[PDB]
Design a protein around this ligand. Structure first.
Ligand code: A1EBE
Ligand code: A1EBE
Ligand code: MG
Ligand code: MG
Ligand code: ZN
Ligand code: ZN
Lengths: 321, 322
């Protein structure tokens, strides 16, 4: 997928409505109601965080419109999710201004937009269990290796390599940041990452000039952004939930077409247990993520608070309220 | 005994409870899990709300709290989280039956709950006695529970930690007796005779509350109900805490396999299949009887029994492959 001459020139015209400017800096901001602004909203966030002279604008608008093209029309892992994850990374880096290099803020905003590129709405287990081509290629973190492969594809396209103008080494530094960040969105790898950071922060040996330590903190940040649907206002959070299950149930529907019972999270015949499942996901995954994050990055506390507020709302739904 | 630093207890005095949580704390099913940084301050609030703001001096109290956390170990279940969970359930029981207990007992039972598993290594009473651990020789029966009380007194005897200094020396030994008895009653090996005795004293109608020997038995049942209160939370919380319990059990079951001895199925991670039926039998024989007799004695404590029943249906739904 390469964007036409027709698409990206309109993106160079876009100026963000000034009434938002302040509301976009909030952690809990929702990009939902501004669909035709999401491509330019990403341009805005790149210019604010990295400077307008960071990328040359012609190359940048092409890359954003091609990446958008390569997102399938699935309920949840779509173009809206990519810009929602990218905004959370924007808010984290804006509130941790003096912690990350220019190169890291470049890659991470790029990595978040492309972290789910060409998602087909299926979990890694589905591709591996039922012998998908990509699973025969990428044995572990199947889609995550595909997501990074899809990004490198677009970057190698003509007029798209926004990283054309870095040092030849500096560029190979960016791709490692982008790869490790996208690989870190594999939720299965999150538990080892967050437990390692737990012991490290606790023992005090968490060293922020240790590169592998930096990559672990980046990975937790990628997880925090990937889950940021739990950190919006409860009206927004409850709505994104409907998108998540519609895609889960669709994968489980394919599981039934054989003759197998999917896990209850992917069974539409078990919608009643959804509020309990959310309460369990927040306590087992979400709360640990943003708690270790806030411990490492104190400015990211609004995420932890918003996640706690959303957790009590699910508890009220379970408790008959 | 690891003493807490000054920055630890200083930040505790400045802590304020978020307005919204003040209401949710009073509910039996309240789950402290998602508010880890708030756990020490939550205990301050529960002490203040039940025992008064002038009860303990905030300086010594915040020292005792943060030092008790430091002496709780990093085992999968019997840790700092478990202490505040048991302490909260006691607060809820005490709040809903406030004037039924003295002011000295509310001070004793809340403090004893916070310290009831101090310095837990993650090994049951049977392990330490089988492999003649030194503590099994110093404490013949109720091995860890007697040590927990010794750990509790060691913290009180630390410089500037004694929150009971301002009691009359009669009431000093009095509250220490309530605390010693409460921490001993958390030995589940004693609950079964004590619950059976309370059940008979109730149905015949001879259970009297200012009968001191009866009073300790009722406090013992309250200490048991608080120790098991994870069965009284919402289903997803109870499953997550069940994983904490089995993670520690199975670790002890591995050590016996290193010594060539098959552990009991409860501590055998190769018998994970029997987990739902093992929970079903624990509820029927232990948990449900505990809160049933407790609700007969203190009817305000019912929501524990109903929530314990709610999770009994879920454990039965799991055994039927659902
Ligand atoms: C794959 C990771 O999930 C997410 O990314 C995810 C989810 C999922 C939806 N949800 C579940 C989860 C279950 C479970 O199976 C719970 N089982 C406990 N553990 C194993 C015993 C694993 C956690 C479930 C069961 C019945 C009905 C509905 C259910 N819904 C987690 N909700 C959000 C919201 C915001 C951002 C992300 N997520
Ligand atoms: C003793 C202390 O137990 C607790 O504190 C405890 C427990 C225990 C874990 N559990 C068991 C218990 C068994 C048993 O062996 C039950 N005994 C049955 N026999 C009759 C006497 C003969 C069949 C078990 C067996 C296999 C696999 C797993 C198993 N899990 C009880 N569950 C909770 C939940 C919430 C708060 C507390 N607890
Ligand atoms: Mg993904
Ligand atoms: Mg104990
Ligand atoms: Zn994602
Ligand atoms: Zn206990």
């Amino acid at each position: 997928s390469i964007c036409t001459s027709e698409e990206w020139q309109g993106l160079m015209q876009f100026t963000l409505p000034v009434r938002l400017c302040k509301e976009i800096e909030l952690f809990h901001f929702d990009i939902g109601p501004f669909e035709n602004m999401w491509p330019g909203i990403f341009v805005y966030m790149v210019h604010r965080s990295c400077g307008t002279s960071c990328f040359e604008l012609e190359k940048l608008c092409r890359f954003i419109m091609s990446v958008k093209k390569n997102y399938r029309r699935v309920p949840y892992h779509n173009w809206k999710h990519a810009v929602t994850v990218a905004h959370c990374m924007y808010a984290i880096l804006q509130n941790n201004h003096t912690l990350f290099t220019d190169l890291e803020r470049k890659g991470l905003l790029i990595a978040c937009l492309c972290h789910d590129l060409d998602h087909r709405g299926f979990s890694n287990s589905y591709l591996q269990k039922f012998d998908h081509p990509l699973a025969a290629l990428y044995s572990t973190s199947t889609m995550e290796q595909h997501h990074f492969s899809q990004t490198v594809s677009i970057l190698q396209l003509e007029g798209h390599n926004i990283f054309s103008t870095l040092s030849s080494s500096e560029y190979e530094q960016v791709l490692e940041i982008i790869r490790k960040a996208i690989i870190a969105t594999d939720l299965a790898l999150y538990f080892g990452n967050r437990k390692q950071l737990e012991e490290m922060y606790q023992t005090g040996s968490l060293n922020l000039n240790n590169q592998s330590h930096r990559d672990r903190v980046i990975g937790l940040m990628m997880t925090a952004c990937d889950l940021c649907s739990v950190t919006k206002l409860w009206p927004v959070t409850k709505l994104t939930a409907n998108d998540i299950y519609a895609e889960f149930w669709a994968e489980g529907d394919e599981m039934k077409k054989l003759g197998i019972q999917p896990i209850p999270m992917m069974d539409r015949d078990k919608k009643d247990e959804v509020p309990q499942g959310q309460l369990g996901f927040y306590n087992a995954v979400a709360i640990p993520c943003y708690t270790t994050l806030t411990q490492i990055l104190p400015p990211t506390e609004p995420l932890l608070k918003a996640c706690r507020d959303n957790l009590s709302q699910w508890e009220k739904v379970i408790r008959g309220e």
